[PDB]
Amino acid sequence: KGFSYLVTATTTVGVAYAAKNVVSQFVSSMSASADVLAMSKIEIKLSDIPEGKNMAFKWRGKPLFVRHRTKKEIDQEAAVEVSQLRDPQHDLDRVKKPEWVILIGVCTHLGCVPIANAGDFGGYYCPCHGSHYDASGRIRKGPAPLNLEVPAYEFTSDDVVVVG
Amino acid sequence: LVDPLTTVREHCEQLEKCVKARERLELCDNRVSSRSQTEEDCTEELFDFLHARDHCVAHKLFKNLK
Amino acid sequence: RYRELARNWIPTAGMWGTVGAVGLVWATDWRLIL
Amino acid sequence: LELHPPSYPWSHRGLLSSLDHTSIRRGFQVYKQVCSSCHSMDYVAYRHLVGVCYTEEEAKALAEEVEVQDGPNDDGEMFMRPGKLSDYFPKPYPNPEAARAANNGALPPDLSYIVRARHGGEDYVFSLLTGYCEPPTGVSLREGLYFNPYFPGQAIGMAPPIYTEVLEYDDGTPATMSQVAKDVATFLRWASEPEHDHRKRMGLKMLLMMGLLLPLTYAMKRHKWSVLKSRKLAYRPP
Amino acid sequence: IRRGFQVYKQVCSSCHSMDYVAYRHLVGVCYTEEEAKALAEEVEVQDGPNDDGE
Amino acid sequence: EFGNLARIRHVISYSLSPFEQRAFPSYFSKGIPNVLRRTRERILRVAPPFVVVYLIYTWGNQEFEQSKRKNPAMYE
Amino acid sequence: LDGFRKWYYNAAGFNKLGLMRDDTLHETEDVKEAIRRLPEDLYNDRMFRIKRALDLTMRHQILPKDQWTKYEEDKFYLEPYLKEVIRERKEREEWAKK
Amino acid sequence: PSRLYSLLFRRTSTFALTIAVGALFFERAFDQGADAIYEHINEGKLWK
Amino acid sequence: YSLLFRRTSTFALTIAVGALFFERAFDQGADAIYEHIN
Amino acid sequence: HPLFKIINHSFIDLPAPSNISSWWNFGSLLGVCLMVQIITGLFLAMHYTSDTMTAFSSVTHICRDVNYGWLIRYMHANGASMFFICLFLHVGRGLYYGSYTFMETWNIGVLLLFAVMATAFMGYVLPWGQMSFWGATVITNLLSAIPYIGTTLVEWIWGGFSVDKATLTRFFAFHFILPFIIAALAIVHLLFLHETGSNNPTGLNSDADKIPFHPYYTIKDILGILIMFLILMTLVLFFPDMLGDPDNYMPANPLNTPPHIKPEWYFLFAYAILRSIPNKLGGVLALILSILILALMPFLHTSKQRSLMFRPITQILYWILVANLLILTWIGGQPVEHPFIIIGQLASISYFSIILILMPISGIIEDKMLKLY
Amino acid sequence: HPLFKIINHSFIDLPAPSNISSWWNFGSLLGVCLMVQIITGLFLAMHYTSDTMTAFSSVTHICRDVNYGWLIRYMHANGASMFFICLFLHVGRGLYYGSYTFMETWNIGVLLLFAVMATAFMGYVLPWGQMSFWGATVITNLLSAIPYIGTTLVEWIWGGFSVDKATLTRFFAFHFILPFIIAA
């Protein structure tokens, strides 16, 4: 009896392997295709954004927000202390250079385009649910869970910032 | 060439209800201007007057126009 | 009487969960989990 | 917070009131002479006009009026042909950037579906085009802006494009700013729904057919259901 | 395959078109990432999204 | 199916042919009274929730407007 | 409390359609059992009552007021039986746990 | 009229036949009528 | 039989576990064979 | 004949209760609406192109040059709206008359409701307007709630970093394929019901009074089909844009976002609940429960009477439930600001407390009033 | 259980002849092939675009950039070939063993055969290659043979003067929708 049962256990094992490989293929197929994957390409000109301006680049589909900040934004941003800061992040740790603020550009509250310079704290604002982001892109008021993600920007130079 | 709208806006403003509104706005205007350190604008005040004027114009503009 | 019945299946039930769980980790190819 | 354009007694508003089709003619003239410099009616082609306010041959005239160069050429990378009936309306500023460049970085939205895309469009359009009033105290529009109480934010890059007698209507109807805004709102409306008239005719036939068919089907149902609705039950225990 | 890609690059590329094959496809087949990056940087392309540059 | 649905006894059931009866007998004659009879028996259970929905909706609208109203003390 | 009850009664309406409380008990397994045990007369009577109700509902109509049930007249025909079904049901259950 | 029933409705096929013919003609009338009604309704606002 | 072939539950466990390992093993051997052929 | 056996039995002689009102028409209307949607959807599929390159235009071409193509497109959109109207009234009939005690039929129903909501969501994404793109991103990111499984899953559906062509094409495939699964699930829905037969508004055993279906509830379904067709066409041919949104007539701009974004009317009640819960995850869960609470409904029936025809206190609680469902539909529309938020929070609290707590307690009280408890 | 009763009634306790050979497997294979085709077809539909400018580009994108997309595409094509192999052997079994005396089953079969041939024809038109376009024109032209209404019918199907995008898109819709009718 054991032998017969052993035979099927073996057969079942092989089948598991079979089923495992196939499903993975389909999910991966639906999963990011090469082309999608091959989009991390990104480059930007710093000189493109004058101080206190939000610039769009839509890198990786997400409308990239490469923003610049005004004197107030560049300087007062640090005044947020920490308790005053809704999130635990640091305003400047978000920017190699304070004036140039680089962020993904999607308010964490279920996704949307942050409206820069509009809102209660000013600096960014999610019209969809009223999330107000400071110039640092840190969620200060509203229901947005976390600060705007800051991409891996490369400050190659002061006139051209190339995330990648 | 008299744009019917022009005339209509006249009659409409002449409406007393509308008249009272404009007054309020002007107060705001001067108040805003007089106030030195402020940011309140009469836009909201302007907005309210318009709604009425426009509604009135709505009642008498289309027909005037050809 | 019910307690006895429950006792009998408690271990086997865990066995079943374990069976699926073993395959689960495998199927999920989760390296994080087992 | 935005001014909400009032309801105007637009002629086409009536349940069975078709678009003037006489006014539209005027409105387009307004788009061709004023609005086509910045905005693009991408989804409306000359052929579309035939049957609404311009006849086949007549449309052919307008089509030829403009010039359209297509790249495919035997050796050349283009060949310029006066627009044919099939050609779509000519969009200026080929790339949007072109538009932004000259429009203070503000893209003139295609006015093809503007009326459909703008809440209360027909009204909005009229209001915006005619809402170019004086900016109030405290307002500080940025360079290259104008003041319209309706436009979202009240800061539309578009400068006021309709000055009384901006263009002359071929029909001769006095070209007052309003007469021009009403005509272009009717036209843009037509643009956003070329089938407005045809549909309303279908709706009239539908109302007549349902007014015929609903009491008759109700009568058939009440025939078949009368039998039961008259059934008298009686309990007669022995 | 690497030698045959060279041939196209030099002799048959000027008149025929390998449209459905991109510099990305070569990585892990004939060239490394940096070699294919250098090969790609050897042919300029057109983007034309400039404020005015089209 | 029919025949095995239920067991009743001594319940006689009279009926008439469709073509032998008027189509809408006393339709508006008793229909109106009945419809009105019906509305009475259900209006107190149905209507007051929708009445207070109307009051809450209006209230919300007006309250919202007042909320949008500028504080007199604002910027002064 | 009778006032309340009688009032609720008229409010429920089951009276209007010539139906006693019992006539309106969902046919759960137990209720069904009791129904079967019902002496034939009550059963046949129950049926006419229910059939009549159905007909009236069909026409969205109610019986003439006079024919309406009366809070007092209403008798609970199944109650005595139903209890038994529940009692027996529970007994078997406890015994199961034994 | 009994004639109608006796001739047009009695035979199921005729019942259909009459319906068929009626349909063939109804369109003409309804279309034209509604068209004109519509035309009159929007008497002046049209392409013409 | 007395461990994985007595009751369905036991049988199930071995299947899951064995399949878990066979997968990698199969690929590994295939590596050799595939490389062997090429 | 084997087929005719299935036919006559199921569609002609099905012993049906004689006293079921017009509400029992609605489910048949849903089936008709399904067929209508499928037919109109097929005639949208002969000219639509999933490419993000030509989507907007494909649709424009549909409403501009495709013969009567505007008619088929607006029939499809307003037929989706009519589908959700008939679906909500069907679910309300099931809640009011105690039809959830047919538990298998109810569970196949709530599966059908989930499938129909997913189909309508992806279909609304399909024209690739401004509103479609921001709507897709938004509740897709909703899926980004799950901590470990969520993020990847989102991009998995997005098929990339952010919704883009990858999504549109797979959403076209899924929106095409799900109504046939809905039709198969509706066949299972009809089967699980004929085993038990339909319910009647009195909630009693209608075995003593059953009539055929062919001449009695067929002409009734035909009349209901005619009335539903009157409302649809008069919502397409005269008021075609009433239920839609104007910002969907703009092309999808990833750089801009429609200032005022809202789900379509039918998905609002849920939207309100989601917005109400402060925690993102909480919102997602509550949202799901909003629909799922129904499935949970057959285990909450504590009354000895099936229907609410003879139950006035639970009738009052039911109409209060319909009332704050309408309130949640309104709130979703309203923007985020006082006092819309508080109403939303209460309305959600009242919704869950009426379904979970108040109705079984009221049924116990009603059983106590009839000297049953 | 009313759902498990049908499944039991058709697959578990169904009384089958004890001596049926391997040929009786083939019809079940056809059902499996149908699913397989549907599943592979669904995973072709998440990346295929029915536009004449982009159909060949989408097929090459499936083969070159989608992870295991070449696998699903060639599984779909060779599964159509396997479907017709199993279909021909199923019909040959029915002809050889006298199974056509089940007349209703045979007629539903030949309806299924017509539907499968139409589905495979439009599916072969779908990749918009050289061979697909000339093949489509050819068979669409077949219809023109009709004595009186032929020209109209051809033009209808084509949706224009000659097969062009109008056809491709409606052929995508029909090729999508017919295997579910085949399943019913």
Ligand code: HEC
């Ligand atoms: C010579 C230039 C010019 C003319 C003439 C012109 N426009 Fe514009 N229009 C613009 C520019 C630039 C913008 C972009 C402004 C912005 O986006 O803020 C614009 C934007 C608009 C918008 C977008 C408003 C919104 O809701 O976002 C509408 C509507 C509009 N124009 C209507 C018209 C109509 C209607 C006419 C004539 C009947 C007209 N325009 C003529 C330059 C023009």
Ligand code: HEM
């Ligand atoms: C298999 C049958 C169906 C097919 C082939 C189909 C096909 C399509 C296509 C091609 C579109 C894009 C057209 C456009 O939106 O501009 C679309 C849109 C849509 N479909 Fe479907 N559909 C089907 C069934 C359904 C069903 C059952 C529903 C309802 C649940 C539905 C709801 C929608 C909605 C809401 C839209 C968007 C309407 C809009 O543009 O605002 N469809 N459908």
Ligand code: HEM
């Ligand atoms: C669009 C999807 C649906 C379709 C097409 C559908 C169709 C039907 C049909 C045709 C019936 C036969 C009885 C009748 O129509 O009155 C029915 C009964 C029923 N459905 Fe649905 N249904 C759907 C969704 C639902 C949902 C979501 C629920 C649960 C909320 C539900 C609950 C029921 C119940 C309880 C019955 C039995 C009611 C009775 O006959 O007394 N259905 N359905």
Ligand code: HEM
């Ligand atoms: C609903 C199920 C199906 C779907 C969704 C579907 C979908 C598709 C799609 C998108 C294509 C074009 C891309 C490609 O596969 O090459 C295609 C091609 C094709 N399909 Fe289907 N299909 C289905 C069922 C079938 C069936 C049942 C058959 C067999 C009769 C079939 C035979 C083909 C063939 C021969 C091609 C051309 C393959 C090639 O490009 O070389 N398909 N199918």
